[PDB]
Structure formats: structure tokens, C-alpha cells
């Protein structure tokens, strides 16, 4: 056997044809980018999430200028973390919890908090509260209030229509004659 | 025929609430990094944008569906130490704090009976030669269990109040007393038959536990959503190896043999065949995601109506008369434990609509005139228990001998 | 808006033809080669319509899914009073108000909210005349001065009479019976 | 400048090459057609929208 394949049709591992060593191949790096921003009003710095990558190769390709796309004014800025989502760059880790402002992935969110800068933290579900238990007492409400809450839901749609010859033809004669060979597709 | 005895039974229901978030990249799924391939998909259209925006929208609403069902809890509440609330053993539904995976013993069995593309786990963040990826959800499984543990600990010490508003301290037999009253029966029965109810409750807990320990079915709703999304990706993978009517399935066997004029002809037909399968996969995921929200809209209703309240609809939350409901977590889905009430052991007798007494016709305020061969009395339609016919509970109006079925008796 | 922008922008896509304009191809090429390349454009533009028409059919289904929800929810809560939990607002539903909107409907759900909860010591029944007297409605509470019966939606005392208390079963059957004398 | 364009790349206005009188260009005329009928059971006359 000279080389191996994956469960798809791709040759994931090869033997060295010279010294018979067996070498896996990793698809060096790619993925998506999201932009994590506080908004243009609140700030002018943004944080980028290099999706689903090991940050060792990301930080390398920043300094080695092996990135596509690249920005002329860009730096790592000593704030890079490898989560399950990938490489968040441009945000400081916070080891306490708050409520999720902008969702990132795997329980981690981010916001623009007081030093303000972009920080990354884990989402909190709520207060560490307690419901006591008795075998003898029932709390009963005495005073009250009312409250009016609004909700909102669409019931219609901007209904359209499309004429064919003003779309696929532009009223040219030759387009209308080819269109006969497609029938009443319109 | 009016039932006398009863039993309580816990029947479970499941549904999906979540499709696995996917994403793709034509630049990798279409080309395999050929530059001339990248320069001929441009000349078709930025269709790439529509695809990326379509999959991210389908993916983002899977995090919306999960918070809409689970995240109905305003405060995380602690697990109480007492779990034998009046004999009612609640150790199976609650998470076990002695374990590292603080899940319920039901959810341990729920995970096991349920459980091509790049993914990152741990943290070994490997990649694949294909352009496919799955994305991890925002709301993690431990956080899903933490919503679920608050819904159960909060029901065990606040009960009816837990979903109605502010959670109020109340004994659990009192919580049963208000719930059992709510279905149309008298709340003496719980105090009268407490150990019978406590054992029938603990029976159906162990019944569900042994049912889900040895099962081959009843989780087909969950695994089908897992399998249907898996078979969409396998079709999307395997059509990369197809020629799509071109000379080759590999772009580096087309540009190799053929000269670059005629190579770009064959490259166009191989790209276009790969675009259509990519576009159709998006439309297929678009339809299947709209299917799942209807189950997520059911689960959002069936949690707030049934767990956080008490349901009075027919066959909603199992069959019988609903009393409680315990939610459990599942991969891409929810599991309910509906405690229902079943009347049983009926008996025949003769009934009547009205009693003639002193020239007037008397009518029950609620219930039926019951003659068991010995005497006449009133009981309710859901349990057999005698009430002496007095004007306190028999409504008096109208004259005798007008209604069909007025019977000479005495009302005191 | 994004559905129409996509339908517009792909008019200018070449789709691998010589251009994206039928006038260029009629002018530049021979009637064989012109007819080939305008046929390449006519099928790219038909697919763009079919994709747009299909995704209109999907969102026409979802909006009908909400319109059938809103026509129900108006009949349930505007034209009446709901009894489902958290349907038409959080709390206890009283009434609701429809308001028009440019492409939808906005509701105003009036709800009741209890608060100001106080401790009261409770027990199931009263052992009077050797009889387990169960509350006809509400629960038994002792406020530190008086035993009485109140509701759970609100606190309001009532004197324990046989008109709001009844007996099923004698004493020494229920756990925790009040050993009080009532009327 | 010589000519104008819409929010999409369609020429809607051209400055005249001779007089520099700038002139909008509208579509010539088109649209859809509908027919109102009370039914063939009732009449043979229709109204056209
Ligand atoms: C991102 O990529 C980098 C690529 O370098 C990767 O770093 C490497 O990770 C592996 C896995 O941990 C490291 O290998 C281990 O290194 C430690 C200390 O260096 C050793 O103690 C280990 O030896 C033990 O473990 C082996 C497997 O568990 C056993 O087989 C062995 O017998 C020993 O018991 C092992 O050598 C490797 O050193 C690093 N490389 C560098 C330069 O740090 C990193 O893991 C990737 N990121 C993530 C999050 O995974
Ligand atoms: C409605 O139907 C239910 C049927 O489930 C019925 O409840 C059953 O009643 C019987 C008798 O009251 C229970 O049987 C006993 O239960 C106790 C509970 O711990 C056991 O310890 C008993 O075992 C001892 O007694 C036996 C007979 O003397 C001995 O042979 C034995 O060795 C033990 O010493 C005995 O099993 C039965 O448990 C319940 N069922 C449940 C689920 O609790 C109920 O009475 C019916 N109600 C009406 C109104 O008809
Ligand atoms: C049960 O809860 C009720 C609330 O839901 C309580 O009613 C409230 O009682 C408080 C006193 O405890 C009142 O507070 C006072 O209000 C007056 C009037 O304020 C209004 O007018 C001024 C001037 O125009 C304006 O600035 C305010 O915004 C108000 O519009 C103030 O002058 C006082 O300083 C003080 O704040 C509440 O007004 C009153 N609410 C209502 C709606 O009447 C009730 O007391 C509670 N009962 C128990 C037993 O706890
Ligand atoms: C616990 O609840 C009882 C009621 O169930 C409270 O007793 C009530 O105390 C008030 C004190 O103001 C009494 O009101 C007064 O009664 C007189 C006599 O009728 C009347 O003339 C006055 O105008 C005023 O209304 C009320 O009658 C009394 N009710 C009963 C049934 O005794 C008791 O105070 C509560 N405990 C605590 C600590 O608040
Ligand atoms: C092409 O350009 C020539 C010169 O640039 C234009 O000719 C001049 O046009 C102006 C107005 O367009 C004329 O002014 C008018 O003249 C008439 C009669 O002469 C008078 O009734 C008006 O009150 C005004 O004064 C000007 O006379 C005329 N000159 C000549 C030598 O013809 C010409 O109009 C341009 N072509 C077009 C189609 O506009
Ligand atoms: C309530 O149910 C639990 C099981 O969920 C019972 O706990 C078991 O008790 C036996 C007897 O010692 C142990 O061998 C098991 O290890 C226990 N289970 C666990 C998970 O620890 C418990 O005994 C029941 N309550 C009562 C009063 O019997
Ligand atoms: C029919 O129900 C009545 C209850 O309303 C039973 O009547 C009582 O029966 C017990 C013993 O069976 C006697 O001690 C009481 O004196 C009876 N009371 C009255 C008012 O009759 C009656 O026994 C039931 N019929 C049968 C056949 O059991
Ligand atoms: C119930 O008792 C009444 C007695 O008031 C019976 O009514 C009488 O019925 C007979 C017919 O059998 C008439 O001739 C009498 O005039 C009725 N009396 C009155 C005062 O109207 C009645 O029949 C009895 N019910 C049954 C089923 O026998
Ligand atoms: C509740 O009150 C009753 C009285 O109504 C108590 O009954 C007495 O019980 C003692 C023994 O416990 C007897 O010696 C008395 O004769 C009983 N009284 C009567 C009038 O018969 C009962 O003990 C009380 N319960 C508690 C827990 O104190
Ligand atoms: C090639 O030759 C070298 C010695 O010159 C030897 O060590 C090596 O094994 C050879 N390669 C193979 C594949 O046999
Ligand atoms: C922008 O930020 C300022 C505070 O710097 C705030 O006052 C203003 O309301 C914001 N405007 C918008 C549109 O968010
Ligand atoms: C009721 O609870 C108290 C503490 O809250 C406890 O001391 C008592 O033993 C309990 N009652 C019973 C019957 O166990
Ligand atoms: C009651 O009577 C009906 C018909 O007379 C019969 O179907 C049924 O078996 C009887 N049930 C009992 C408990 O006698
Ligand atoms: C009721 O009692 C509990 C403890 O017994 C206490 O924490 C709580 O604050 C009390 N509430 C009121 C309103 O007194
Ligand atoms: C409609 O057609 C039927 C024949 O199918 C005819 O008998 C009837 O008269 C017609 N209606 C009117 C209003 O003339």
C-alpha cells in the first residue's frame, strides 16, 4: 500500500516514497471570518473571529504575512484565544460571567465593557438563587400590580409580480424567439 | 358507570427542537483551491454571498429555537438536599451532584440511546479536505442541563407558583393538593391515599427508567433529525466525485491533459454541476429547518403550558388528567415526563336526573343522582363517593312532574 | 428587499457568457455564435427567477403560519379571555388590544402580577368534632393571631365556617390536622 | 458627464448630445392584464383591467 484515503475521495495520508515513513496531510488552514463589533457609534475597534482553527497557525500566518485577506493596518495585539469556535483576536479574556451581549459560540459571548474595550466572557444563565422548602408554611401574595406587555408579529408580505420579457429579454426580439423553445415556463 | 379506584402513570414524549448548524465554502467545496476555478465562478455571480447568508440564517435560528424552549427560567435555583418530599422520591429526575457530569439518571440514558465534515472537539481542532463544517451551538449542553435542573428543583419546592410568577415556598403535599383539585376531584383523596399515590409515582419512575434502559425505539423523532441532516451531507460529499457530464471529476486532471482554452470549458461544466448540488442542499436545509421550528413552537408551548402550569386540554401532555410535568434534556431535542391521572374500576348502578320532593323538582348543583340499590345520594363523575342529598348541594327550582325522570325521594 | 436585490443584481452576471448584455452579443457575434451565447443568458436568467419564486413560496408559507396564529390569537384574547399560561402575555391575562401596523399586527396584553408575599403557617385540615374538616376553597393559614382560610392568588381572611369548609373522613387519617374549634 | 443611471445599472437619463438638454427615459409601456367575468352562465360581456 502506497497511500491512504479518507471516507470521502481524498487521499489524506501518504507514505514517503523514499524512506517509507507514513505521513498524514492536513488541509493547512481555512475557514470563515466574523466581525465582532460594538457598533460604529460606541467605538472604532473591532474583533475578528478566525473560525475553527488552531491559533498557533493563525498567529504564525499573521506575522509571516501568509494571510488572505490581509489588512494594511492590522496587529494581533496580544489578545488571542483558542475556543471551540476558533481564534478570537482582538478581545481580552474575562474569567467571570455576565449576560450574553453578542453571541460567539460554545457559551462564550462578548461585549464592550469598562477597562472601554472589547472583552470575552462566559454567558451566565441567571442569579444564584434559591427556593426554600417548608413542610409547614406557604408564602401568599398580598399586594400586586398590573403590567401591559406588547408583542408584534407580521401577517402579510409585500406581494410582487414579475414580467418575463422585461426581465429575461428586455423586449428584444431574439430573446422572445428563443423563449418559445422553453414553452410556457413563464 | 362511575369509577372508584385510580392510579397515576407517567408517560413520556419527545420531539426535536434543533437542527445541527452547518456552513460551507464554495471556494473549497467548488474548487479545491484551483485559482482558475476561482476565476470562473466569479464570472457566474457572487452567488457565494447568497449561500453564506442563507446558511448562517438557518444556523442562527437554531440557537433561537433552543433558547425559546429551555430559557424560560429567570433565576438559577439550587438543588435541595431533601429529595423524599413526603415520600415522593425525586432522585431520578434531579441531577446527581456526586458525579462530574451533573445530569439526571434519566438524561444519562437519554444521551446514550440517542447518540465527512470538519469539527473541533475538546481541544483537537482538526480540518477536512472538504469545505464542510458543523458549528457548535451557543447554548452548551451543560447550560442546557442547568436550565433543566432549575425547572425541576423549582417545581419540587415551588410547584404551581414556579411558572405562574415569583416562586413561592410551599410544601409539596400542598402543591399536590392544589393540582389534584384543579382537575375536578376532591383533595381529601391525596391525604387519604398518600402512600398509594407515592408508590404509584415511584413505580412509573422506575418503569420509565427500565423502559429507556432497554429500548430500541421511542427516540425515533430525535435520531431521524440527526440522520436526515447526515444524509444530506453524504449526498453533498459524494457528488464531488461525479463528473457532472464533464471530462473528469478532478480539476487537476482537466487542466493537466487539456490545453487551458478547452480546459476552462470543462472547468465551467464541473463548477456548474457543483454549484447546483450546493444550491439544492441549501434549499433542502431551508425546508427542513422550517419543519423543525413547528416542533420547536410546540415545545415552547408544551413547556410553558404543561411544565409551568397545569394543562386542561384533551390528550395534551399524555393521556389522562394532567398533574405535573418534568422536562429532560436530549441531543437536539427535549424530553417530557407527564404525570397524568387515570380513573379506574367502574361499577354499574341506576341514575336519575331529578328528584320530586314536596311538589318541586330538585337538581344537582354538580354530580348525579346515584341509587346503589339501598338509597339515593350524590357523587362526582370522576370518583365514587357518597353525598347525602340536601338542599346545600342540590339546586332547587321548578315544579315536579315536568322533567322526564323525576323520582319520588326525600331531600333533607 | 434582499430577495429583490438578488433578483436585480444577477441580471448583470455574465454566467460565463461573453457579456451580460444581449445587445453586445447581437452586435458583436455572428447569428450562430450570438444565438448560442444569448441562449446561455436565457437559462441563467430563468434559474434566477425560479430560485426567487421558490423562496417566495417558502416565506409565503411562514407568514401564513403566523397569520393563522394571529387570527387565532386575536379571537382568543381580544375577543375573549385566555386561560393558557403565558399565551397573550406573561402573568394572568385580563384583556388585550389590537393595533394596526404596516405589514402586521401589534398586541397590547394586559396582565395581572402578584407581589409582596408574606409567610403564613399552613396545614391541611381541621379536627373539629372528631371530623377532618377540609377547606372547600383555599388553604388554612395562621397569621400569628387567627386561624382562617385564604386564597393563593391574593391574601384575604375569611372566618372558618361550614359554608367554606367540609368534612370527608374523620380525624387521625390525614397527616397534620389542625386541632382547632370552628363554627 | 453624458448620461445617468438608476440605483441599478440601467440608463434612465441621457443628456442630449446636440442641445445638452438632459432627458429622463421611462419604460415605454407594459404591465399585466386581467379579465372580469360574471360567468358564461350569466353573460357574454367582460370587463378588462
Ligand atoms: C495547535 O497545534 C500545535 C502544534 O504544535 C499543538 O501543539 C502540540 O500539541 C501536542 C499535544 O499535546 C504536544 O505533544 C505533547 O507535548 C507534551 C509537552 O510538550 C508532552 O508531555 C506529550 O507527551 C505525552 O503525551 C503523548 C500523547 O498524549 C504520549 O504519547 C507521550 O508518551 C507522553 O505521555 C506530548 O509530546 C506537542 O508538544 C505540542 N507542540 C508544541 C510545539 O507545543 C497544539 O496542541 C494545538 N492546539 C491545541 C489546542 O490542541
Ligand atoms: C385500588 O387498587 C390498588 C391496587 O394497586 C389498591 O392498593 C393496594 O392495596 C393493598 C392492600 O391494602 C396493598 O397490599 C399491601 O401493601 C403493603 C404496602 O407496603 C404491603 O406491605 C403488604 O404486604 C404485606 O401484607 C401481605 C398481605 O397481608 C403479606 O402477604 C405480605 O407478606 C406483607 O406482610 C400488602 O402487599 C397494595 O400494596 C396496594 N397497592 C399499592 C400500589 O399500594 C387499593 O387498595 C385500591 N383502592 C380502592 C379504594 O379500591
Ligand atoms: C400596593 O402597591 C401599590 C403600588 O402598586 C401602592 O400604591 C402606591 O403607594 C405609594 C406609597 O406607598 C404611592 O407613592 C406616593 O405617591 C405620591 C404621588 O405620586 C404621583 O404624583 C407625583 C406628583 O404628581 C408624581 O411625581 C409621581 O410620579 C406620581 O405620579 C408621591 O407624591 C409620593 O412621594 C409617594 O411616592 C404611590 O403613588 C401609590 N401608587 C398608586 C398607583 O397610587 C400601595 O400603597 C401598596 N399597598 C400596600 C399595602 O403595600
Ligand atoms: C390575623 O388575621 C385576623 C383576621 O382573620 C386579624 O384580626 C383582625 O384584627 C383587626 C385589627 O384592626 C380587627 O379590625 C377591627 O375590628 C373591630 C371590631 O369589629 C372594628 O370595630 C374595627 O373597625 C376594625 O375593623 C378585625 O376585626 C380582626 N378580625 C378578626 C376576625 O378577629 C389579626 O389582626 C391578624 N393578625 C395580625 C398579626 O395582623
Ligand atoms: C446648435 O448650436 C447652435 C449654436 O450653438 C444653436 O443655434 C443657436 O441657438 C439659439 C438657441 O438655441 C438661438 O437663439 C434663439 O434665436 C432665435 C432666432 O434666431 C430667437 O427667436 C430666440 O429668441 C433666441 O435668440 C440662436 O439664434 C441660434 N443661432 C444660430 C446661428 O442658429 C442651435 O440651436 C443648436 N442646435 C439645436 C438643435 O439646438
Ligand atoms: C430513591 O431512589 C434512589 C435511586 O435513585 C435510591 O437510592 C439507591 O439506594 C440503594 C440502597 O442503598 C443504593 O444501593 C443505590 O446506590 C441508591 N442509588 C443511588 C443513585 O445512589 C433511594 O434509596 C430511594 N429512596 C428510598 C427512600 O428508598
Ligand atoms: C349504598 O350507599 C349507601 C351510602 O349512601 C350505603 O348506606 C350505608 O351503608 C352502611 C354500611 O353498608 C350503613 O352502616 C349505613 O347506615 C348506610 N347508610 C344509609 C343512609 O343507608 C349502602 O350500604 C350502599 N349499598 C350497598 C348495597 O352497599
Ligand atoms: C310520586 O308521588 C306522587 C304523589 O304526589 C305521585 O303523583 C300522583 O300520581 C298519580 C298517578 O299514578 C295521580 O293520579 C295523582 O294525582 C298524583 N298526585 C298528585 C298530587 O299529583 C307520582 O305518581 C309518584 N311517582 C311515581 C313514579 O309513582
Ligand atoms: C387534639 O384535641 C383532642 C381533643 O379534641 C385531643 O384528644 C384528647 O386526647 C387525649 C390523649 O391524647 C385523651 O386523654 C383525651 O380524652 C382526648 N380528648 C377528648 C375530648 O376525648 C388530642 O390529643 C389533641 N391532639 C394533640 C396532638 O394534642
Ligand atoms: C534509496 O537508496 C538508499 C541508499 O542509496 C536507501 O537507503 C533507500 O532505502 C532507497 N530507497 C528505497 C525506497 O528503497
Ligand atoms: C450614539 O452614542 C451616543 C453616546 O456617545 C448616544 O448619546 C447616542 O444616542 C447614540 N446614537 C445612536 C443612534 O445609537
Ligand atoms: C418539618 O420540618 C421541620 C424543619 O423545617 C423538621 O424539624 C420536622 O421534623 C418536619 N416534620 C416532620 C414530620 O418530619
Ligand atoms: C355494567 O352493565 C353493562 C351492561 O348492563 C355491562 O357492559 C358491564 O359489564 C357491567 N359492569 C359491571 C361492573 O357490572
Ligand atoms: C419567610 O421566612 C423565610 C425563612 O423562614 C425568610 O427567608 C423570608 O424572608 C420570610 N419572608 C417574609 C415575607 O417574612
Ligand atoms: C345557466 O345555464 C343553465 C344551463 O346549464 C340555464 O338553464 C340557466 O338558465 C342559466 N342561467 C341563467 C341565469 O340564465
Amino acid at each position: 500500500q502506497q497511500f491512504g484515503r479518507d471516507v470521502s475521495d481524498f487521499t489524506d495520508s501518504v507514505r514517503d516514497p523514499k524512506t517509507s515513513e507514513i505521513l498524514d496531510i492536513s488541509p493547512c488552514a481555512f475557514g470563515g471570518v466574523s466581525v465582532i463589533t460594538p457598533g460604529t457609534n460606541a467605538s472604532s475597534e473591532v474583533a475578528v473571529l478566525y473560525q475553527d482553527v488552531n491559533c498557533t497557525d493563525v498567529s504564525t500566518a499573521i506575522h509571516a504575512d501568509q494571510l488572505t485577506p490581509a489588512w494594511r493596518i492590522y496587529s494581533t495585539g496580544n489578545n488571542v484565544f483558542q475556543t471551540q469556535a476558533g481564534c478570537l483576536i482582538g478581545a481580552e479574556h474575562v474569567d467571570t460571567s455576565y449576560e450574553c451581549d453578542i453571541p460567539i459560540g460554545a457559551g462564550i459571548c462578548a461585549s464592550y465593557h469598562t477597562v472601554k474595550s472589547i472583552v470575552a466572557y462566559t454567558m451566565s444563565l441567571g442569579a444564584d438563587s434559591s427556593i426554600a422548602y417548608s413542610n409547614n408554611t406557604i408564602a401568599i401574595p398580598t399586594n400586586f400590580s398590573i403590567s401591559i406587555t406588547t408583542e408584534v408579529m407580521p401577517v402579510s408580505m409585500a406581494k410582487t409580480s414579475v414580467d418575463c420579457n422585461m426581465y429575461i429579454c428586455g423586449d428584444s426580439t431574439e430573446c422572445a424567439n428563443l423563449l418559445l423553445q422553453y414553452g410556457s415556463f413563464c | 358507570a362511575i369509577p372508584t379506584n385510580f392510579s397515576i402513570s407517567i408517560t413520556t414524549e419527545v420531539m426535536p427542537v434543533s437542527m445541527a448548524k452547518t456552513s460551507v465554502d464554495c471556494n473549497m467545496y467548488i474548487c479545491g483551491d484551483s485559482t482558475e476555478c476561482a476565476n470562473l465562478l466569479l464570472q457566474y455571480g457572487s452567488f457565494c454571498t447568497q449561500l453564506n447568508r442563507a446558511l448562517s440564517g438557518i444556523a442562527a435560528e437554531q440557537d433561537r429555537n433552543t433558547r425559546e424552549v429551555f430559557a424560560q427560567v429567570k433565576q438559577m435555583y439550587k438543588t435541595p438536599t431533601l429529595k423524599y418530599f413526603g415520600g415522593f422520591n425525586f432522585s431520578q429526575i434531579l441531577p446527581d451532584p456526586l458525579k462530574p457530569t451533573k445530569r439526571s439518571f434519566i438524561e444519562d440514558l437519554l444521551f446514550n440511546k440517542v447518540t465527512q465534515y470538519g469539527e473541533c472537539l475538546g481541544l483537537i481542532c482538526a480540518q477536512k479536505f472538504n469545505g464542510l463544517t458543523v458549528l457548535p451551538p451557543l447554548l452548551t449542553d451543560d447550560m442546557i442541563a442547568a436550565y433543566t435542573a432549575a425547572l425541576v428543583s423549582g417545581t419540587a419546592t415551588a410547584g404551581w407558583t414556579f411558572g405562574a410568577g415569583a416562586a413561592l415556598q410551599i410544601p409539596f403535599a400542598m402543591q399536590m393538593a392544589y393540582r389534584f383539585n384543579g382537575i375536578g376531584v376532591t383533595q381529601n383523596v391525596l391525604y387519604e391515599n398518600q402512600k398509594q399515590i407515592a408508590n404509584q409515582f415511584n413505580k412509573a419512575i422506575s418503569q420509565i427508567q427500565e423502559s429507556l434502559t432497554t429500548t430500541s425505539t421511542a427516540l425515533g423523532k430525535l435520531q431521524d433529525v440527526v440522520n436526515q441532516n447526515a444524509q444530506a451531507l453524504n449526498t453533498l460529499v459524494k457528488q464531488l466525485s461525479s463528473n457532472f457530464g464533464a471530462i473528469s471529476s478532478v480539476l487537476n486532471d482537466i487542466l493537466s491533459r487539456l490545453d487551458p482554452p478547452e480546459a476552462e470549458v470543462q472547468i465551467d461544466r464541473l463548477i456548474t454541476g457543483r454549484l447546483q448540488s450546493l444550491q439544492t442542499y441549501v434549499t433542502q436545509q431551508l425546508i427542513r429547518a422550517a419543519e423543525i421550528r413547528a416542533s420547536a413552537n410546540l415545545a415552547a408551548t408544551k413547556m410553558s403550558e404543561c411544565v409551568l402550569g397545569q394543562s386542561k386540554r384533551v390528550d395534551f401532555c399524555g393521556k389522562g388528567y394532567h398533574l405535573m410535568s418534568f422536562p429532560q434534556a436530549a441531543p437536539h431535542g427535549v424530553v417530557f415526563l407527564h404525570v397524568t391521572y387515570v380513573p379506574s374500576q367502574e361499577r354499574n348502578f341506576t341514575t336519575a336526573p331529578a328528584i320530586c320532593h314536596e311538589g318541586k323538582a330538585y337538581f344537582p348543583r354538580e354530580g348525579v343522582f346515584v341509587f346503589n340499590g339501598t338509597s339515593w345520594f350524590i357523587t362526582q363523575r370522576n370518583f365514587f363517593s357518597p353525598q347525602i342529598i340536601t338542599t346545600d348541594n342540590t339546586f332547587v327550582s321548578g315544579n315536579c312532574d315536568v322533567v322526564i325522570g323525576i323520582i319520588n325521594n326525600t331531600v333533607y
Side-chain angles (χ1 to χ4, degrees), chain A, chain B:
Chain A
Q1 288 176 352
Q2 294 292 320
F3 58 99
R5 289 181 183 270
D6 201 359
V7 296
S8 66
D9 51 355
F10 289 98
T11 65
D12 53 357
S13 179
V14 299
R15 182 186 289 272
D16 191 1
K18 184 175 181 179
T19 59
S20 298
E21 186 176 359
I22 298 165
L23 294 172
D24 287 335
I25 306 168
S26 179
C28 158
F30 63 94
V33 181
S34 299
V35 173
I36 307 171
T37 181
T40 60
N41 190 6
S43 175
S44 65
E45 63 180 359
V46 295
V48 292
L49 179 62
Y50 290 94
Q51 295 177 358
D52 291 332
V53 282
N54 188 353
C55 289
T56 304
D57 290 330
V58 177
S59 298
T60 299
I62 292 169
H63 292 286
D65 201 1
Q66 300 177 4
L67 295 172
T68 300
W71 306 271
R72 293 195 302 275
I73 303 167
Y74 184 73
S75 65
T76 306
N78 289 319
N79 289 319
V80 50
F81 291 99
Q82 184 174 0
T83 67
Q84 293 83 11
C87 290
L88 171 56
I89 293 174
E92 296 177 354
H93 184 272
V94 175
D95 53 355
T96 186
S97 67
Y98 297 94
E99 293 177 350
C100 185
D101 194 359
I102 303 169
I104 299 168
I108 296 168
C109 298
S111 180
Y112 184 66
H113 282 167
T114 305
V115 174
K116 290 183 180 179
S117 64
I118 294 170
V119 296
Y121 60 94
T122 61
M123 186 186 78
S124 179
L125 281 79
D128 192 2
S129 178
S130 177
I131 302 161
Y133 184 73
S134 66
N135 52 4
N136 51 5
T137 65
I138 293 175
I140 291 170
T142 62
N143 204 359
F144 61 95
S145 176
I146 69 168
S147 178
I148 301 172
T149 306
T150 61
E151 295 179 357
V152 48
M153 52 189 292
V155 298
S156 179
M157 190 174 72
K159 56 183 181 180
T160 63
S161 180
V162 170
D163 196 359
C164 284
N165 300 322
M166 287 302 294
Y167 186 76
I168 66 170
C169 294
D171 285 334
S172 67
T173 309
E174 293 83 1
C175 176
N177 294 316
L178 289 180
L179 187 55
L180 296 175
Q181 300 296 320
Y182 297 99
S184 295
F185 189 77
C186 284
Chain B
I2 285 174
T4 67
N5 202 353
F6 66 97
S7 182
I8 63 172
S9 67
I10 309 168
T11 305
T12 184
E13 298 180 357
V14 294
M15 58 191 72
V17 296
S18 175
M19 190 179 68
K21 296 191 287 185
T22 64
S23 178
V24 184
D25 184 19
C26 55
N27 275 337
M28 252 331 256
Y29 168 84
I30 301 297
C31 291
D33 293 335
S34 175
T35 304
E36 295 302 320
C37 173
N39 299 319
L40 292 176
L41 56 86
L42 186 61
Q43 293 177 335
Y44 297 104
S46 289
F47 298 81
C48 295
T49 302
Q50 194 153 354
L51 286 204
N52 276 321
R53 260 196 224 155
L55 289 175
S56 179
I58 293 166
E61 302 295 326
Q62 304 297 316
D63 284 329
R64 186 177 68 92
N65 292 321
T66 305
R67 290 193 302 272
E68 280 163 349
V69 176
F70 284 98
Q72 293 173 354
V73 185
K74 295 178 184 178
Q75 287 178 352
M76 295 296 108
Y77 302 111
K78 295 183 182 295
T79 297
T81 302
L82 291 176
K83 293 179 179 179
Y84 57 105
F85 291 103
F88 294 162
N89 197 359
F90 287 109
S91 68
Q92 294 290 321
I93 308 102
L94 283 173
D96 191 6
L98 298 176
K99 291 186 178 184
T101 60
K102 295 181 180 180
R103 304 182 175 174
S104 71
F105 293 93
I106 306 164
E107 282 171 353
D108 292 330
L109 305 174
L110 289 171
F111 270 100
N112 292 320
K113 288 292 185 180
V114 170
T115 299
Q116 297 295 324
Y117 56 90
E119 67 184 4
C120 295
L121 292 177
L123 185 61
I124 294 169
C125 192
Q127 293 176 354
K128 299 295 182 182
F129 286 148
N130 197 359
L132 298 179
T133 182
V134 69
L135 292 179
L138 172 69
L139 189 59
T140 60
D141 58 353
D142 293 332
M143 296 179 182
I144 287 168
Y147 286 117
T148 307
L151 289 168
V152 177
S153 292
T155 310
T157 57
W160 180 67
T161 62
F162 174 67
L168 306 182
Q169 182 170 4
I170 177 165
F172 198 82
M174 299 301 292
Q175 298 183 3
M176 290 292 106
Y178 186 73
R179 287 181 184 272
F180 188 76
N181 191 4
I183 71 170
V185 289
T186 307
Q187 63 270 19
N188 52 349
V189 180
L190 300 174
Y191 299 105
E192 288 174 353
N193 293 318
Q194 180 175 1
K195 292 182 179 180
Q196 182 179 0
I197 287 165
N199 289 321
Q200 285 172 351
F201 184 76
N202 292 321
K203 277 185 180 183
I205 291 298
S206 296
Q207 287 174 354
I208 290 172
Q209 181 177 359
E210 290 181 353
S211 178
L212 297 178
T213 305
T214 60
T215 182
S216 65
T217 182
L219 295 179
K221 286 184 178 178
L222 297 176
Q223 283 186 354
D224 188 71
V225 172
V226 173
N227 290 322
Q228 283 183 356
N229 199 0
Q231 293 175 357
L233 291 170
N234 289 320
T235 299
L236 193 65
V237 170
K238 287 183 181 179
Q239 293 178 358
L240 286 176
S241 68
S242 180
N243 293 318
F244 292 106
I247 186 170
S248 176
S249 66
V250 175
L251 289 174
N252 290 317
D253 290 329
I254 297 169
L255 190 65
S256 172
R257 178 180 181 179
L258 295 174
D259 291 332
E262 293 177 350
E264 290 179 353
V265 175
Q266 299 286 322
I267 284 170
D268 286 331
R269 293 182 183 174
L270 188 56
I271 288 171
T272 305
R274 288 179 182 177
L275 291 182
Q276 289 182 355
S277 294
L278 184 57
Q279 186 176 2
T280 301
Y281 168 72
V282 172
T283 302
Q284 293 294 323
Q285 294 297 103
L286 184 56
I287 289 172
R288 294 177 186 180
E291 292 287 330
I292 290 174
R293 291 179 304 170
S295 297
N297 291 319
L298 186 68
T301 302
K302 198 179 287 185
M303 183 172 286
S304 64
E305 175 66 29
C306 194
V307 177
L308 301 181
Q310 188 167 2
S311 179
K312 304 297 174 67
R313 297 173 66 190
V314 178
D315 290 332
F316 198 78
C317 302
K319 300 181 186 296
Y321 287 164
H322 178 267
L323 306 179
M324 287 188 287
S325 182
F326 289 163
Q328 298 295 308
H332 297 275
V334 298
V335 179
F336 292 101
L337 297 174
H338 300 300
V339 176
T340 65
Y341 180 75
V342 176
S344 178
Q345 298 187 2
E346 290 86 1
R347 181 177 181 170
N348 285 323
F349 54 88
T350 304
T351 184
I355 282 182
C356 188
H357 184 74
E358 296 175 352
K360 293 179 179 179
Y362 294 177
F363 296 94
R365 295 176 64 186
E366 184 66 30
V368 288
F369 293 106
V370 172
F371 181 68
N372 60 351
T374 300
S375 66
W376 290 87
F377 52 89
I378 294 169
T379 194
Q380 298 296 321
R381 291 177 179 87
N382 297 320
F383 66 101
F384 179 74
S385 178
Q387 292 298 319
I388 301 168
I389 307 166
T390 66
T391 63
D392 291 330
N393 55 4
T394 302
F395 183 72
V396 169
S397 181
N399 294 318
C400 181
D401 294 332
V402 176
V403 174
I404 301 169
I406 308 172
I407 294 169
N408 285 324
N409 288 316
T410 60
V411 175
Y412 293 153

